[PDB]
Every structure is written in structure tokens, then in C-alpha cells.
């Protein structure tokens, strides 16, 4: 059974470590956990829909899943306005039913099915140290992930499109007909610096690049899956890695930690695949919106915003970036790399154009600037909107704040877990994870350092 | 083979200081950061941290002492932009805009991550269990939070912690003004972690010192009763457990030394993990609890609490911090 410390060597608080050499029960654990994930997706979608007020913006209602469905072009119209809440309901309900199916399978393999799959089948039974089988399973899952990326491509190209916040006239659901298949453009995002003004793959600012990158990712994942089904690890790969279940877990933990940090930065900075109609403005967006709002107000009052001098001698409203571009003044000079659909019509070749600023600011831009200024991603833990010194009137914390904070916590803890399991896999492969042998202590066989 | 000899030297456990491959990255970055820190702390010219052409003097030669001196963070005009030496037209421009801060913090973060990796590496070479690096990940996460993650969330390396004592105090006070860190549960967990770490450190030390087995006289120090590498236990854990189990009650006392030392490792590390996560989650502006005007009487008059007094202090810090840098009512970042 291996369901106690004496038989397994693991205490109850490490009891899932008893599942390492038990393929059937481990499969049950995985399938039940996948059922848990799908259950949260469906139940959270239904919870968010049940409290959804469609006339209020999504970012004011504490929603994180409905904006994801809206970004896919389901249920929304021009400007992000909800036209139909039934697709959200369908997504939630189908996830809940599929989660019931996955929970049934997980429970069956965990407590009723065979504890080891090796006797029942050679296809499904696996040994962790069988490199060929591990690469085969990895190849199957790579093909599955590539099919998922191509499913996003299919939704964007043939099944209604995606919400484009950069669409002409305003954000709208648009079918992407010309994805960027150029490897220079696609793989130029991977070579971009992660620092200010460059932003690496977080700086993707159009859906054509998104769809082209997903075509490339789906094709690459399918090709790599076929590659790992057809091949065995090479000698350098065999000598460079530890080949055990905990080692593979630690590799995945490091990868997931990196992806968690990337997603944190993506939801904090990107407003293309996280449109500000659904997720609210970014921090840079809100600061630029405040500067824009007071520029409009004082320009209506008669101020010459190009020549107004702030207290320090810099431009109160307009100043120059370190490379000469005309940018908004004040502290929001740190956010001059921000690009947004409401701000781009006033940007010329040298930055913000003074003539367009004087003559071309439309009322929808003013409404957007005021709305994004007053919905800055700043809030308290008990969902009080505004700075830490604000009074209790506004019940608002941005979804960008919730997603970024939660996934930074998760990414850091998964880095810690990767360190734990990588060290433990190395020690267990080397044979001293349970401590130092008294009769063969290595340090006692080493010369002194004086 | 020359490469094989170099690999044998790098991974050698007979070097006085272990290098390892994490060390071949760690040593140059830490040396660069240390040398640049000493040179900047002594002799750097004033730095325009706010980007408002009001440079802040941080070095000893320009009128500071040990307490007030700092390596001032890079300019707010730079923001999150990468600012190496070769991106500046001259060294005078680089020093004006706070380039040494970026150089030092990037080299230090790289070197400290490789210090964690090097701790793992030496533990592996010596046949040890590998989780000392996991314990070191808590101060490393704290350093990443205050030097990298908070600038990323706020959008400028000017909001990172200055490399000095008074600059650190300025960072603390402005952070309390803008995020109410005292009312954040992650910082309260961190305070519990450090207070408990000091408590359990003093407790474990006093209990072990209390139960030291007599091997000396009143003439000599008790520490000479222990010899390096002796097999026998130098103190009586049964006597210490009896004392502590009579002090509170028996089942509140560890009798397992391994369980006790795991608790000693686990309490401050988890607490500091949570406070580093607190700094990062307030970097994404998820601030501490806001209970301002929460208590309301029957008519609707605000009944102040201690949270409102904290709010008054935070308002004072907020209206006085960076007194020339704001042009608009909301301090959005």
C-alpha cells in the first residue's frame, strides 16, 4: 500500500512523496488536480457572471476571468461593451461539467484503479529513469500544447477574431487576416531587452504579432513533440541532467516560476492582450491619463501648456525625454514609454504634438483620461480605492493589481520549490539526501584549509 | 587537458574559498559592485534622483558622513531604462543621472543569486543536504524586492532603496506614506518572523548554554569544555527539555533536536519570505489595510481610531515627500 511512514519512509506531511513510484495513483492525483483547476475556472466564471453588472466596466467589479473571455472576442462589442453574457455562461458551465468528469477519473485512478500502470500496459506504464519513455510523454504533451496554440490562432482567424483595443475607430472584435509570420519580427521580440522602452515580449502591441507568434509557437511545439517521440536524449543531455521524477518536477517548477514572473510583468504593463477596457488602465496608463487630464483642464482655462514652467524649471505639462521626445511632465516622465490608443492620435514624429494637443483633443479622449486617472491600479488589501491615505468611500482594486500580486507570490514560491526539489533531486541521485554517513564522512577525508 | 584542469580547480573543495561555476559568475560581479560602491560612497558627485534637476549629495567627499551617506538611485527621467556607462555621452553625465546605482544593484543581484547557487554547489560537493540556499533565499528575495521588484512596479529605479543608512530610512518612511506597510499583514508576518527569530535565537542559545555539561573550572572559560570534532554531545538536551517543559508546559517543549532546529530555520525564513512578498505586492500597489473613517456613529460622524492617527502621520509624510516633484493632485506612482 505504501500509505504509512514505516513502509514508505515519508511522513504524512510529505505523503504525496509516497506517490513517486506508483504510476496509477500518481495519475489519479494529477487527473483529480486537473479537475480542481477546471472546477475553479467554471465555478469562478459562474460566480463572476452571477454578480456581473454589464453596464459597469469589468475592472470595477473584481473580475479576472470574464476579461479573459472578453479578450477572446466572446460576448463583447465595440469599445468593450458587453452585448451578450451567454458565452461567459457557456464557458463556465462546460468547465464545471468537464471538471466533474476529470474528478471522476482522478478519484477512480487514485483509490480504485491499479496502483501501478506497468503491469496493465507498457504504453501508459512508465519508469522515471527510462529517458525514451519520458521524452515520448513530453512529445505527446508538446503536441497537445501546440494544438492549443493553434486553437487560439483558429479563434483569431476563423471563429470571430479577438478584441483589438488598437482597432481603428476604437477597440472592437476583429478577425486577424494577416498574421506576422516574419521570423525577424517574431524572434526580434525574444532578443529585445527587458528594460525600459524595450520590454521584451511584454511589449507586443498588435494582434497580428500575437497571432503570428502563436502560429510559430504551435508549429514549433508540434515539431518538437514529433522530435521527442522519434528520438532519444543525446549523450550531452544524458550527462547534463538528473533523470528522476523529482528532478523533472524541479525543472518544471523553475519553468513555471519564470512563466509566473513573465505573466506578472505582462499583466502589469501590456494593454494589448490585456485591454484596458476590460482590465482597467495600467499604472503608466493612469499616470499619463492624469497628466493629460490636467493638461486639458488648464488648456481650456487658457494656459499655454507648451511654455508653462513647473516649480523645478521643467515643463509643468510637457517636457523632453532623455532622447528628445516631447513627453508629459511631472513624475509621469518615468512612464513616457507608455503607448495607448487614446493617446496615440496626439503623438507626432517628435512625440506629443503641440498643435494636435491645442486643437485635436476629442471628448472621448478626455473621458478616457479622466476614467483612467480615477481608476488607477492603486488600492488597499480590503479593496479601498486610491492611495493609502484615502478615506473609505470607493470599493475598487484593479484586476491588474490582483493578478500581478498573486502571480508574483506564486512565481516566487515556485522558485523556492524549484530550489528545494533541485537540491533534493541532486542529493538523492548522489545518495546523501538522508544525511551524512558517519563511517564515510567526506569532509574527514579532505585536507585541511588551515 | 587544460579545460579539465580548469574544471578540477573551479570545483575543488581544497580551495580556501570555494569557487564553483556559480562562483565564476559571483566573484567578478560582486567585485565590480563592491569596488563601484566604495568609490561612489566616497567620491560620487550629487545625483538628480527625482529627475527634476535637484541633485542629492550622497558621498563622503561632498559633505556626508557614514550615517547620511548613500549611493543615490538613478534618475526618475531614466525610469526603468537600462543605463550603462556606454549609454552616457560622458562619465559626468553618467554620474549626474545615477548610473553607479544601476551598475551596483545589477551586479549585486547577479552576485547574490550566484551566492545562493554557490551555497547549493558547496553543499553538493561536501555531501551535505542542500537546503541552506533555501534559507538564504529569504534575504535574497528581500534584496530583490527592494532593489528590483519595487522599481519595476513603480516604473523607475529612482524608487528603489538607496544604498545608505539615511536613504534606507527615507525609503521606509515614504513607503509607509504611500502603501501603509505597517497595516499590511505580510509585513506583520515579517515582524513576527524577525522578533521570533531573535526570541528563538536567544532562547536556543540560553537553553543550550544553561545545559552545558561541566568540563572546566571557574578559572577557565566554559567554551574550552568543547573540542572541535568531538563525538559526544557538549550539552544535556534532556535537562534543557525538562527546564523548558517546566517553564511553560511539557508538550510546548521540543525534545527532538532536529525538529527544534528545523523550527529555528523555518520561522524567520517564512516570515522574511512573507515580508519580501509584501514589498513586491505593494510594488504592484496592493497596499495595507485602509480603515480610515471605518467607525461611524449613529448620526454619521466619523469616530477616529488609531488607524486615523496613523493616517494623519502618513498624510504628513505624503505631503512632504519629494516636495518639488509633483505637479498633479494624485501621486499615482
Amino acid at each position: 500500500t505504501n500509505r504509512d511512514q514505516e513502509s514508505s519512509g515519508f511522513a504524512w506531511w510529505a505523503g504525496n512523496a509516497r506517490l513517486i513510484n506508483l504510476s496509477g495513483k500518481l495519475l489519479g492525483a494529477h487527473v483529480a488536480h486537473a479537475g480542481l483547476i477546471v472546477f475553479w475556472a467554471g465555478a469562478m466564471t459562474l460566480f463572476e457572471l452571477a454578480h456581473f453588472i454589464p453596464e459597469k466596466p469589468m475592472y470595477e467589479q473584481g473580475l479576472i476571468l470574464i476579461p479573459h473571455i472578453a479578450t477572446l472576442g466572446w460576448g463583447v462589442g465595440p469599445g468593450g461593451e458587453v452585448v451578450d453574457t451567454f458565452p461567459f455562461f457557456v464557458v463556465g458551465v462546460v468547465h464545471l461539467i468537464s471538471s466533474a468528469v476529470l474528478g471522476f477519473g482522478g478519484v477512480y485512478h487514485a483509490i480504485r484503479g491499479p496502483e501501478t500502470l506497468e503491469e496493465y500496459s507498457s504504453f501508459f506504464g512508465y519508469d522515471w529513469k527510462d529517458k525514451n519513455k519520458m521524452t515520448t510523454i513530453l512529445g505527446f504533451h508538446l503536441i497537445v500544447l501546440g494544438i492549443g496554440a493553434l486553437l487560439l490562432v483558429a479563434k483569431a482567424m476563423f471563429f470571430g477574431g479577438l478584441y483589438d483595443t488598437w482597432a481603428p475607430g476604437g477597440g472592437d472584435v476583429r478577425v486577424i487576416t494577416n498574421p506576422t509570420l516574419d521570423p525577424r519580427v517574431i524572434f526580434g521580440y525574444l532578443l529585445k531587452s527587458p528594460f525600459g522602452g524595450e520590454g521584451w515580449i511584454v511589449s507586443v502591441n498588435n494582434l497580428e504579432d500575437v497571432v503570428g507568434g502563436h502560429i510559430w509557437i504551435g508549429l514549433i511545439c508540434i515539431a518538437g513533440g514529433i522530435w521527442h517521440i522519434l528520438t532519444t536524449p543525446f549523450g550531452w543531455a544524458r550527462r547534463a541532467f538528473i533523470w528522476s521524477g523529482e528532478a523533472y518536477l524541479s525543472y518544471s517548477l523553475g519553468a513555471l516560476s519564470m512563466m509566473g514572473f513573465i505573466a506578472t510583468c505582462f499583466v502589469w504593463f501590456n494593454n494589448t492582450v490585456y485591454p484596458s477596457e476590460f482590465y482597467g488602465p495600467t499604472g503608466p496608463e493612469a499616470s499619463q491619463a492624469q497628466a493629460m487630464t490636467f493638461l486639458i483642464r488648464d488648456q481650456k482655462l487658457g494656459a499655454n501648456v507648451g511654455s508653462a514652467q513647473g516649480p523645478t524649471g521643467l515643463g509643468k505639462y510637457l517636457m523632453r525625454s532623455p532622447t528628445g521626445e516631447i513627453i508629459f511632465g511631472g513624475e509621469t516622465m518615468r512612464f513616457w514609454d507608455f503607448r495607448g490608443p487614446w493617446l496615440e492620435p496626439l503623438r507626432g514624429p517628435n512625440g506629443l504634438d503641440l498643435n494636435k494637443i491645442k486643437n485635436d483633443i476629442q471628448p472621448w479622449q478626455e473621458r478616457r483620461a479622466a476614467e483612467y486617472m480615477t481608476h488607477a491600479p492603486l488600492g488597499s488589501l480590503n479593496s479601498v480605492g486610491g492611495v493609502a491615505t484615502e478615506i473609505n468611500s470607493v470599493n475598487f482594486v484593479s484586476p491588474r493589481s490582483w493578478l500581478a500580486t498573486s502571480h508574483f507570490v506564486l512565481a516566487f514560491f515556485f522558485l523556492v520549490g524549484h530550489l528545494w526539489h533541485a537540491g533534493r533531486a541532486r542529493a538523492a541521485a548522489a545518495g546523501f539526501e538522508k544525511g551524512i554517513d558517519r563511517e564515510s564522512e567526506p569532509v574527514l577525508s579532505m585536507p585541511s584549509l588551515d | 587537458n587544460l579545460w579539465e584542469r580548469f574544471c578540477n580547480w573551479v570545483t575543488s573543495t581544497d580551495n580556501r574559498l570555494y569557487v564553483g561555476w556559480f562562483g565564476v559568475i559571483m566573484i567578478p560581479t560582486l567585485l565590480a559592485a563592491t569596488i563601484c560602491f566604495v568609490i561612489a560612497f566616497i567620491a560620487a558627485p550629487p545625483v538628480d534622483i527625482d529627475g527634476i534637476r535637484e541633485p542629492v549629495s550622497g558621498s563622503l567627499l561632498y559633505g556626508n558622513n557614514i550615517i547620511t551617506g548613500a549611493v543615490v538611485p538613478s534618475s526618475n527621467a531614466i525610469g526603468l531604462h537600462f543605463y550603462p556607462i556606454w549609454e552616457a555621452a560622458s562619465l559626468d553625465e553618467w554620474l549626474y543621472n545615477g548610473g553607479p546605482y544601476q551598475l551596483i544593484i545589477f551586479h549585486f543581484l547577479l552576485g547574490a543569486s550566484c551566492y545562493m547557487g554557490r551555497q547549493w554547489e558547496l553543499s553538493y560537493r561536501l555531501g551535505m543536504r542542500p537546503w541552506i540556499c533555501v534559507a538564504y533565499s529569504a534575504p535574497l528575495a528581500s534584496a530583490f524586492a527592494v532593489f528590483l521588484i519595487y522599481p519595476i512596479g513603480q516604473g523607475s529605479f529612482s524608487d528603489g532603496m538607496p544604498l545608505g543608512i539615511s536613504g534606507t530610512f527615507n525609503f521606509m518612511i515614504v513607503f509607509q506614506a504611500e502603501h501603509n506597510i505597517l497595516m499590511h499583514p505580510f509585513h506583520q508576518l515579517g515582524v513576527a518572523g524577525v522578533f521570533g527569530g531573535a526570541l528563538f535565537c536567544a532562547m536556543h542559545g540560553s537553553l543550550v548554554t544553561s545545559s552545558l555539561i561541566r568540563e572546566t573550572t571557574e578559572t577557565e572559560s566554559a567554551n574550552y569544555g568543547y573540542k572541535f570534532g568531538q563525538e559526544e554531545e557538549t550539552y544535556n538536551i534532556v535537562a534543557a527539555h525538562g527546564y523548558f517543559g517546566r517553564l511553560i508546559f511539557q508538550y510546548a517543549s521540543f525534545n527532538n533536536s532536529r525538529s527544534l532546529h528545523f523550527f529555528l530555520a523555518a520561522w524567520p525564513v517564512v516570515g522574511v519570505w512573507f515580508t519580501a512578498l509584501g514589498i513586491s505586492t505593494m510594488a504592484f500597489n496592493l497596499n495595507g489595510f485602509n480603515f480610515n473613517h471605518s467607525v461611524i456613529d449613529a448620526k454619521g460622524n466619523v469616530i477616529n481610531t488609531w488607524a486615523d492617527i496613523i493616517n494623519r502621520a502618513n498624510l504628513g509624510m505624503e505631503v512632504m515627500h519629494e516636495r518639488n516633484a509633483h505637479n498633479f493632485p494624485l501621486d499615482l506612482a
Binding site: 585541511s448 588551515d450 | 566616497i42 567627499l61 572541535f228
Partner: peptide
């Protein structure tokens, strides 16, 4: 003279670091 004092104390500290690392009492098994 205050800057010289601070730098002198710091340099003495670093020299003490060197001597404590490389010219320590060697720990011996007993």
C-alpha cells in the same frame, strides 16, 4: 579630517576581514 577618519576605520575593518579569513586559528580535530 572626518572623511579620512571614516575611510581609515573602513580600511582597518577590511584589513581585519583579510586577517580573520586567511590568518585565523586553524580548526583542528580533537
Amino acid at each position: 579630517m572626518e572623511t579620512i577618519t571614516y575611510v581609515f576605520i573602513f580600511a582597518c575593518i577590511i584589513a581585519l576581514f583579510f586577517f580573520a579569513i586567511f590568518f585565523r586559528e586553524p580548526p583542528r580535530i580533537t
